[PDB]
Design a binder for these strands. Sequence first.
DNA 1: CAGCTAATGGCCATAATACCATAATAATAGTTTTTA
Length: 187
Amino acid sequence: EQRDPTVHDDVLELEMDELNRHECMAPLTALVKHMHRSLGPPQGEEDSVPRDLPSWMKFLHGKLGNPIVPLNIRLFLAKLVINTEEVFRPYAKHWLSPLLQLAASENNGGEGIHYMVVEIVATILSWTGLATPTGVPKDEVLANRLLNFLMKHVFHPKRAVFRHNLEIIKTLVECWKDCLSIPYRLI
DNA sequence: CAGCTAATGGCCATAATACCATAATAATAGTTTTTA
């Protein structure tokens, strides 16, 4: 690396067909699917690392540039099976994801902002008490900025195009808060 | 007668009238929205 699937934003600056046209996932999918049937209901992990470093899920990192994006794009349907806290740090990857990166991708396609955050957070609710992590330990700066941008954007595009689009977010908004970072006076 | 009347020739102000023409509001519908 880099390799072509690891050369990313060189083109394709909106998010639509990177899931459709990357032509990479589907093997990666059943890949981590079946070998995750090996590592799976056989054993779960409240931890990030033990499912990665021995896994090829370590190969997945998703930090620092385009090195971020596709890997965690990889995480997309990955976490479908993955959870629990096994994606613990990858979670931190996720709230990390939108910040200057989806920002770097900007609107990233009309439905893009969704396309990221949809399960960026919608995984946050993939658990209850495991969101005690989502709030407290490493979210430290994370969700604060996160929200800031998120909100910041999502205000208009409804204004730009049409309505309950945001509301889709307004949900997420709702979904957030049992304590969190309060960019709210700022709201 | 006396002087031609004197109501004849004319008719301007009016008030009335009209058309005729709006806000003070209060409606229509309206084209978008997805849903189906």
